[PDB]
Design a protein around this ligand. Structure first.
Ligand SMILES: *[C@@H]1O[C@H](CO)[C@@H](O)[C@H](O)[C@H]1NC(C)=O
Ligand SMILES: *[C@@H]1O[C@H](CO)[C@@H](O)[C@H](O)[C@H]1NC(C)=O
Ligand SMILES: *[C@@H]1O[C@H](CO)[C@@H](O)[C@H](O)[C@H]1NC(C)=O
Ligand SMILES: *[C@@H]1O[C@H](CO)[C@@H](O)[C@H](O)[C@H]1NC(C)=O
Lengths: 229, 296, 50, 49
């Protein structure tokens, strides 16, 4: 039973590696359109389009999920109901990972990486372009229950892992939001500290595309021309 | 304008050497139908040291001068190793049509790299022919740049069903080279490698072994930061990058702040003093002394 | 607009002279140099007429 | 091409999948009947009797 909630100006992330300060630069990249309905779930298989926006208060990427093609985890024969189990022991008051039934076996492996061992809100953006798997995130503390906070917050990149394989489906491992990225062009405002304070759409609203044409956040009273029909 | 006084060079300290033994003459080479791809990172790529392990008979590049390979550092170089016939070396070219160039591994029009191939006499030649190497001949549609095919279906010609239904006009697209030493030189096996890479799209990874020098500030000189060359003063930067920044641009879209690869610091860039020179005179007939005026 | 005109490749490899000079040999350098020069000259002519 | 009634239907030097889309000048046809062991002899680069 999926639920639909309107997005509120979220999903802006630094498009490139360059530092700009107090500039009104514009660029085109795979972004999240503003005010778009996003599925709300409270473990279905979700198709992976050109881009995904995950934000909730363990991920599985693959195609067949039967140890026939390599699958990103963060050749595995996934179970019918793959999950993770943390058991609260009675002998000692601690939470151990007694139950582990994520997959069956791993025969062939291409790349393996293990990092260091490891109320709020986590935002995640996944995109595979030119064989690179880039993850964007920001751990933003909030104290709300329902309704994504209004405002803006950039998403700094975490790391790039070069894999470059087919990704069509993904399954998560409890409320989470999933949105889909589309090719769009925004006008990314910058400040003295070189942070993206605000941004504006260029295809949503004729006023927005007027702002896009003028390259400013204030529109003087009068008539303007934007595009061609 | 004032001329630079000296020059400086800064390059990350890397001692690893890129392994080319498997890329060059080795025990096995892949097929054109399933072309192998290898990743090269965090090592040193030299070209003059490539003339002692295996013989070279084809040394050409498209987009990069083959005499500056030790001058500019690279980023994410790709090497594709496979074997094709000797009469197909011209087919591996940007925008040049060909049987392999259409129904097999192709090359994008904006390719920037080198294509290297050498003749194989008996390394990949058998008396009865080499049937291990397969080359596609039939395809429903042309491949997009850097695409692989693994399907073993029987090509469909006409209205007769194929793809497992063997019958009329059903042909297997994969044929065998059948390399034999008795054949002509134009049909001998050729081990071709393709070097594709990106420049200034990310932090530098594979660079030439030319060492860095001590950093000098307050004097505008020729600087080369990670393959970026220019001219300007070097001064400390009060503005602070994020941990994932290394370049800086302005409204003019020109580089002005570059992270030092060695000391991991930030240096601001500003061109040397520049302006215009004008002179005034009270009249040639009256006298000869003149005055000099500078503008900026 | 005159300043923004720099970043256009004009059909050449890149919009910066330094990259072209280092990457290519002198015999092949001119093929991009003249391509850049024609565009920049056209931009200057437009600016001066205006 | 899709007659499905010819024992042998082979085109050499051109793509047999695209021939009703090319304009030529003259067409010359020669027809004769040969034995079953002589079909392979009739081919480019082939010799025999
Ligand atoms: C999103 O779609 C759902 C139904 O698919 C609809 O109920 C909801 O109103 C839509 N949201 C927007 C943007 O109007
Ligand atoms: C796993 O790797 C081995 C060794 O390369 C190979 O023989 C085997 O076919 C691989 N498994 C699958 C399912 O292809
Ligand atoms: C990925 O897989 C889908 C089906 O699972 C297929 O349609 C698509 O062509 C594949 N793409 C690549 C690049 O392998
Ligand atoms: C910019 O950064 C400085 C350095 O911390 C800070 O003092 C200043 O408040 C920042 N400007 C803002 C947040 O507008």
């Amino acid at each position: 039973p999926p639920a639909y909630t309107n997005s509120f100006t979220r999903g802006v992330y630094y498009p490139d590696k360059v530092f700009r300060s107090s500039v009104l630069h514009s660029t085109q990249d795979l972004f999240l359109p503003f005010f778009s309905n996003v599925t709300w779930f409270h473990n279905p298989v979700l198709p992976f389009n050109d881009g995904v926006y995950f934000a909730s208060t363990g991920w599985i990427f693959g195609t067949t999920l039967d140890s026939k093609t390599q699958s990103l985890l963060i050749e595995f024969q996934f179970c019918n109901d793959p999950f993770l189990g943390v058991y609260y022991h009675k002998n000692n008051k601690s939470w151990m990972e007694s139950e582990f039934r994520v997959y069956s076996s791993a025969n062939n492996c291409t790349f393996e990486y293990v990092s260091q061992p490891f109320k709020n809100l986590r935002e995640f953006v996944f995109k595979n372009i030119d064989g690179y798997f880039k993850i964007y995130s920001k751990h933003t503390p909030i104290n709300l229950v329902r309704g994504l906070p209004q405002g803006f917050s950039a998403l700094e990149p975490l790391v790039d892992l070069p894999i470059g394989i087919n990704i069509t489906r993904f399954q998560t491992l409890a409320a989470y939001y999933v949105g889909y990225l589309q090719p769009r062009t925004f006008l990314l405002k910058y400040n003295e500290n070189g942070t993206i304070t605000d941004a504006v759409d260029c295809a949503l609203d004729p006023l927005s595309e007027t702002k896009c044409t003028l390259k400013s956040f204030t529109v003087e009273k009068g008539i303007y021309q934007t595009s061609n029909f | 304008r004032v001329q630079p006084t000296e020059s400086i060079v800064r390059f990350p300290n890397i001692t690893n050497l890129c392994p080319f033994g498997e890329v060059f003459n080795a025990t096995r080479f892949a097929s054109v139908y399933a072309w192998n791809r290898k990743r090269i990172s965090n090592c040193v790529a030299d070209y003059s040291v490539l003339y002692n392990s295996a013989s070279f008979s084809t040394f050409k590049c498209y987009g990069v001068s083959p005499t500056k390979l030790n001058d500019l550092c690279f980023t994410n170089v790709y090497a594709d190793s496979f074997v094709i016939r000797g009469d197909e070396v011209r087919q591996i070219a940007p925008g040049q049509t060909g049987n392999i160039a259409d129904y097999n591994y192709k090359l994008p029009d904006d390719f920037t790299g080198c294509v290297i191939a050498w003749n194989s006499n008996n390394l990949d030649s058998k008396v009865g022919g080499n049937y291990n190497y397969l080359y596609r001949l039939f395809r429903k549609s042309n491949l997009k740049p850097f695409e692989r095919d693994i399907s073993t279906e029987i090509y469909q010609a006409g209205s007769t069903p194929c793809n497992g239904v063997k019958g009329f006009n059903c042909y297997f697209p994969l044929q065998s080279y059948g390399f034999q030493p008795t054949y002509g030189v134009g049909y001998q096996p050729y081990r071709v490698v393709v070097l594709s890479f990106e420049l200034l799209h990310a932090p530098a990874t594979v660079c030439g072994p030319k060492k860095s020098t001590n950093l000098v500030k307050n004097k505008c000189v020729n600087f080369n930061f990670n393959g970026l060359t220019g001219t300007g003063v070097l001064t400390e930067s009060n503005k602070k990058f994020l941990p994932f920044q290394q370049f800086g641009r302005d409204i003019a879209d020109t580089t002005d702040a570059v992270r030092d690869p060695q000391t991991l610091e930030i240096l601001d860039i500003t061109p040397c003093s520049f302006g215009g020179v004008s002179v005034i005179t009270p009249g040639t007939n009256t006298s000869n002394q003149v005055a000099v005026l500078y503008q900026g | 607009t005159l300043v923004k005109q720099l970043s256009s490749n004009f059909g050449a490899i890149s919009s910066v002279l330094n990259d072209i000079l280092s990457r290519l040999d002198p015999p092949e350098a001119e093929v991009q140099i003249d391509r850049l020069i024609t565009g920049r000259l056209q931009s200057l002519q437009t600016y001066v007429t205006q």
